[PDB]
From a paper:
Class Ia ribonucleotide reductases (RNRs) are allosterically regulated by ATP and dATP to maintain the appropriate deoxyribonucleotide levels inside the cell for DNA biosynthesis and repair. The α2 subunit houses the active site and the allosteric sites, and the β2 subunit houses the di-iron-tyrosyl radical cofactor.3−6 On every round of turnover, these subunits come together to form an active α2β2 complex, which allows for the transfer of the radical species from β to α, affording ribonucleoside diphosphate reduction. Excess dATP inhibits RNR through the creation of an α–β interface that restricts the ability of β2 to obtain a position that is capable of radical transfer. ATP breaks the α–β interface, freeing β2 and restoring enzyme activity.
Residue numbers in the entry:
A (entry chain B): 3 to 736
B (entry chain A): 4 to 736
Write the structure that this text describes.
């Protein structure tokens, strides 16, 4: 041994294991069941003569990263702190970060930070904000979290790979930018409170916000909903609108249900329609227009009513079989269903297929007035002049669920629930569609041109509360104030490439805040998914969420004024989510209301809301790993998730596995979806928009190794029974 | 004995004398036709209770099957029999009703435009009815009548009812186009144009024949769109395509300006994903209004050979490869200039650039060839500019290889499209072409679908029937009728896109070609390959262009020249006889027979109503009407067999009885050398381009495979004689 090492400056000195052993001790503080000697054993054997000190540092990182297991979960924090150490050297040349002001100035000169930081904050104000920063909080990240920070969030050079900042400078400047326009009387106060909220992992922020809000970029929109009209001018506008947003890396929600069916006459019969599929293809290439091949890049979800005439051709657009002429595979789909459609299924009757051009007012009423829909639907069924097609409800629903089973990307949206239990008046601004992940339900209006100021493209800013980072529900009051005010300030911060999109964003100021670490949240309270023991807890939890969110936005409307289009909301008429929820929820939950909604109701009727929507439960796979949380409301598939990477295999252990290893309920440890869907329904009672609920099935739990069709339709009807608005993925175990 | 079923529902015993009465009336003046032979094959198919309509359709098909080389006049027998039935379906009798009574009835039904009764009085309709000779319906061939019944004649697409005859079509097309003409000469022009199209002297496009009298105003069938290097332009181009393919029009897309894969955006805020993902977006725009996504409309996308992704764009049509790098449902046209061919002959390399990294290289590539070579070599010597070196021999081989397999990879010599052009390259250069590569018009990219600063090139088509004229001096009258009619259509048709109307109203570009050229050489006893038609072609197409220009020139004296005439070479007194490829002087010694110098001074002073007039387009539909050969292309056989809904339709080449040995079939030709020489001579006078085809027979080559050496031989041969574009490459199987 006694080999030589290579320092950073190029120098060379005899190896000193005491220096390595000294570092490992500083990264193992407070950790349990960790062996420094075991790390050194796996590290020393890899050492060679003339080794770089940087390679030595990465060696003890990977060596500790491989020791991440169920038996010793704290190795994910050991390798993390070791990774933090190296990133300090890469960005600063030392451990302790420079002064906040000295950092910003240097970065602005390089052109990595926005210059408005030095314009909106003085040097003295930067000194005060630096005191808020606790750089020791970087030791609270997990190993999987650091890899996410180093690769996605932290400002860096995409060419050389140099890191230019740490995790704490990220949080303090995101807070600095969002509240930069606040008066100095309260500006620095909000900056501190919001910083401590996101640094202690109480509020989770989306990827484009974490890696953007401090950089010169202003592209923060990642959720786009576009409704397409039945005209070439509208299709061209929709297509152009897609290209503009997928170029900014945004999820697209397309509503092409208005497009008339194949064979439908045009201009009295001067020409005849060629089908929706040729236009669906045009939308797909628009989405894949900025993808290095047409496979990756961006994705979208196209929506259409079940009673559409070509519905038998649209459901089978994703299956691998069939020719390219009748397949549009690289997009997802969401079939829109209402009460009358399910009724025909239960009664085993038929479903009459119409083209939305041959049935006047049938489409609009399909979303707004269900009573008017059933009137028009039955009227046009008995009409022999209207072109139609008869298909049995049992077969149609079976075809839908069949393709949903194989592809797993065919989604369901109960549109009647999206307007009967909605924050919007269906008579003024109805919800006719959703987004990519089916958690967004916002009003839309078709565009006659890409720059049409009469259309409306729905945008929504996302965020999430971390239920695993709060000790009680009364903390949400403070967190809601910080979350809403920050996102609302971002709306006036970001840019809008399409005029019709800015109209909706400035008009309604729609927000969508969800939750993460819900699985771990049930584990702490000793609850589960399937048994239905978390029903009362869920009702208590999401009540506190929605109440404090509304209260935060309501007080914000007193300060800066309500949104311009607030009169188009149900809140303006004094209608709360606790008034229009699915009454079938009363049979699965008896938890009482713990907050004064009636006082809130009068406060909203008088002062209004800053935002038309506030709550929306979205999936979180990237933002969750930062706080070491479970993916949204979904249960973990295992105690330890294994994901390969550029620096080897990354392992992430569920939070507090040492004390809750039996408290957790894995995905495939569940009997069925009945317990899960009931919880979703209870959440939906308070959630303004929708929930990205997933259906799960294990072929091994069913005879002949196949999931029966009777079970699929059962859970589907079960979901609709409890007021579930949307259904996302269908996970099939292999 | 047996009984037949009348139209009214009645029933009468069969009368063979009635059928023999009809057949005799349809065989008048015909030679080598046997009425008894038709009756022999017709009577045996008869059954009791047969409908008279089925009887009529039986004797038609029976006469249609007897169409052969030995007796070519059967094509007129079955035709006249088909005409008879169409008279009954539309009028209920043989003799058509009065013109005025017909129009009024049709307008009431909403099949004709009401502006016919507004622009013409009852007395004027009576005068036009005197011009109509309904006996001319007996001059159509069987293949021609079938085309009338299915494409041209106004009908109900649901019930299948015919609402008019062929003569009402011609007289009302003439009536509408000249409806705005002064009373002094209006009916005078109506008659002359009627006699021109009814005697098959002037051939008109499908959308004109089936449109100009109906309430529709969609007559644009030729669209050229240039795409800029921006999302705003790609979206605009996409929107522009969809609206025009919805009107059934051919699209010419120029997506050469789109920067290559990896090119930096806004200094490097984002990086390009390639041209191919955008090509797919253009394709679905084309196939957006197509039954199933396969039929409907088609387009041709153009890109320069020196483009960086040229190795990826050349192989977009082959059946091989994954879907990620294939765009098969569109045709392509590689743009080549002098420097590219020079690198080929010297066996050197071709440097590939992205049009975003080479300032002014794209513009000079079309406009200034001298400037191009300067910039190309300069940017070649620069090591800071991203580039890629590929051998000229290999690049050309890859191009011709995919052209050989697909037959849809086209070639456009852009240097010839501006050195020998009716447009000033410094003001309005030709940067692209159309679907069939016969159109060469200036274009400007759109920053929006409704951009008033962009320019979408449109062109109205037509053709002279060389087999229907007795001399070349007849073209003087025909050009006057042709140009004035098409120019009037420009103010008649609608424009769904502002940028398209700008080009149409500004330059008023026309494109008149020819049909029956193969039969034209047969009458004069000339051929393609031997080069015996070189001097004849030079004489013919001179008379075409001269009489075309002279017609438009005097039209400019009457109604004023086109607004953007100052951007033409004609304005500076430059004629096609001044800027042609000088290599043509070695293959033709035919002198000019017309006073061009008098025309030259008349153009400098009074100008031209139209910036362009001549363009040789393919004609497969309009040619069958006049029983002509498909454009300038030679026939593949003496009799063409084409299946249909009513059986097998047979068409015999014109005057086969006297010219069976005079003709030169397609596969009876040694090579393309004889053909390309003729095309080169035509290009000397043609304003735009020619849809020239290259033909090859694997049986005439050893090992049953066409050598690459021959493909490059004919390609360089074409460029040598100033051939602007190359269309199909027909490979015999
Ligand atoms: N006070 C500290 N607490 C925790 N980690 C530290 C501290 N100071 C430095 N580090 C980190 O420990 C690693 C080594 O630090 P440092 O350069 O001070 O010591 P060394 O490399 O072991 O020895 P040498 O004096 O030869 O440089 C680096 O990744 C650095 O960021
Ligand atoms: N003078 C004519 N010259 C040529 N064709 C004619 C003439 N008169 C009629 N025809 C056509 O010949 C066909 C038969 O004519 P027509 O109806 O008068 O006689 P028919 O059918 O044999 O007997 P009928 O109708 O009296 O029972 C029709 O298609 C009609 O248009
Ligand atoms: N002489 C040495 N022998 C063995 N390990 C060493 C030696 N010096 C440093 N190390 C260890 C300490 C850390 O775990 C790891 C990385 O040290 P690091 O401080 O980043 O590099 P460095 O010491 O060469 O540069 P610097 O001069 O900036 O401190 O290497
Ligand atoms: N030529 C065409 N071929 C195929 N589909 C077409 C064609 N033209 C339009 N379409 C499609 C696009 C739309 O979905 C629909 C026609 O709608 P639109 O663009 O508004 O036409 P329009 O307004 O002129 O007539 P309409 O009164 O029938 O709506 O049919
Ligand atoms: N009784 C008959 N026996 C045999 N052939 C007949 C008879 N009547 C007519 N034809 C022939 C004449 C034509 O060649 C062919 C089609 O006749 P067509 O004139 O179109 O119908 P039609 O005679 O039944 O009605 P219309 O009274 O309108 O003339 O049938
Ligand atoms: N996000 C994107 N992903 C992929 N391709 C893109 C993206 N944005 C633009 N493109 C394409 C479209 C154009 O061909 C080209 C950029 O041109 P353009 O739309 O005019 O952008 P720009 O004007 O903002 O920047 P530039 O100065 O580089 O042209 O790259
Ligand atoms: Mg060190
Ligand atoms: Mg319309
Ligand atoms: Mg009759
Ligand atoms: Mg640009």
């Amino acid at each position: 041994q006694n080999l030589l090492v290579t320092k950073r400056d190029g120098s060379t000195e005899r190896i000193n294991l005491d220096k390595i052993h000294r570092v490992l001790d500083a990264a193992a503080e407070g950790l349990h069941n960790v062996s420094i000697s075991q790390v050194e054993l796996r590290s020393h054997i890899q050492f060679y003569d003339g080794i770089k000190t940087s390679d030595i540092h990465e060696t003890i990182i990977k060596a500790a990263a491989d020791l991440i297991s169920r038996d010793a979960p704290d190795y994910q924090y050991l390798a993390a702190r070791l990774a933090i150490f190296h990133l300090r050297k890469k960005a600063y040349g030392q451990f302790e970060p420079p002064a906040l002001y000295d950092h910003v100035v240097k970065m602005v000169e390089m052109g990595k930070y926005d210059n408005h930081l030095l314009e909106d904050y003085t040097e003295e104000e930067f000194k005060q904000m630096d005191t808020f920063i606790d750089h020791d909080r970087d030791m609270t990240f997990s190993y999987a979290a650091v890899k996410q920070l180093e690769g996605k969030y932290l400002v860096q050079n995409r060419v050389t790979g140099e890191i230019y900042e740490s995790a704490q400078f990220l949080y303090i400047l995101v807070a600095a930018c969002l509240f930069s326009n606040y008066p100095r009387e309260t500006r620095l106060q909000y900056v501190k409170r919001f910083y401590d909220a996101v640094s202690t992992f109480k509020i989770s922020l989306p990827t484009p916000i974490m890696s953007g809000v401090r950089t010169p970029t202003r592209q923060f929109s990642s959720c786009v909903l576009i409704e397409c009209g039945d005209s070439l001018d509208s299709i061209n506008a929709t297509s152009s609108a897609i290209v503009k947003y997928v170029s900014q890396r945004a999820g697209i929600g397309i509503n092409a249900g208005r497009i008339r069916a194949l064979g439908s006459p045009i201009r009295g019969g001067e020409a005849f329609h060629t089908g929706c599929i040729p236009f669906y293809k045009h939308f797909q290439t628009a989405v894949k227009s900025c993808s290095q091949g047409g496979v990756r890049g961006g994705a979208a979800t196209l929506f259409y009513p079940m009673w559409h005439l070509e519905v038998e051709s649209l459901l089978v657009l994703k299956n691998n079989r069939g020719v390219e002429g009748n397949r549009v595979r690289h997009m997802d789909y969401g079939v829109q269903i209402n009460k009358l459609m399910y009724t025909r299924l239960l009664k085993g009757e038929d479903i009459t297929l119409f083209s939305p051009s041959d049935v006047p007012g049938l489409y609009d009423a399909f979303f707004a007035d269900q009573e008017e829909f059933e009137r028009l639907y039955t009227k046009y069924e008995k009409d022999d002049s209207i072109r139609k097609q008869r298909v049995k409800a049992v077969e149609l629903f079976s075809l839908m669920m069949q393709e949903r089973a194989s592809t797993g990307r065919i989604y369901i949206q109960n549109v009647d629930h999206c307007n009967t239990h909605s924050p919007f008046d269906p008579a003024i601004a109805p919800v006719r569609q959703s987004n990519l992940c089916l958690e967004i339900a916002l009003p839309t209006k078709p565009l006659n041109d890409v720059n049409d100021e009469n259309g409306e493209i729905a945008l929504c800013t996302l965020s999430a509360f971390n239920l695993g980072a709060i000790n009680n529900l009364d903390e949400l009051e403070e967190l809601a104030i910080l979350a809403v005010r920050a996102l609302d300030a971002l709306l006036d911060y970001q840019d809008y490439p399409i005029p019709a999109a800015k109209r909706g964003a400035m008009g309604r100021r729609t927000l969508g805040i969800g939750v993460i670490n819900f699985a771990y949240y049930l584990a702490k309270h000793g609850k589960r998914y399937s048994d239905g023991s978390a029903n009362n807890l869920t009702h208590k939890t999401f009540e506190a969420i929605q109440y404090y969110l509304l209260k935060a936005s309501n007080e914000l409307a007193k300060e800066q004024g309500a949104c311009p289009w607030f009169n188009e909301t149900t809140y303006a008429k004094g209608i709360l989510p606790i008034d229009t929820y699915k009454k079938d929820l009363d049979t699965i939950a008896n938890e009482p209301l713990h907050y004064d909604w009636e006082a809130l109701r009068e406060s909203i009727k008088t002062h209004g809301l800053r935002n038309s929507t506030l709550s929306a439960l979205m999936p979180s796979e990237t933002s969750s790993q930062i706080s070491n949380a479970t993916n949204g409301i979904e249960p973990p598939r295992g105690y330890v998730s294994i994901k390969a990477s550029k620096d080897g295999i990354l392992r992430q252990v569920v939070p507090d596995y040492e004390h809750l290893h039996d408290a957790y309920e894995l995905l495939w440890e569940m009997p069925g979806n009945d317990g899960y869907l009931q919880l979703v329904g209870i959440m939906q009672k308070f959630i303004d928009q929708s929930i990205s609920a997933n259906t799960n099935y294990d072929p091994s739990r069913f005879p002949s190794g196949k999931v029966p069709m009777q079970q699929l339709l059962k859970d589907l009807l079960t979901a609709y029974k409890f007021g579930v608005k949307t259904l996302y993925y269908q996970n099939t175990r292999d």
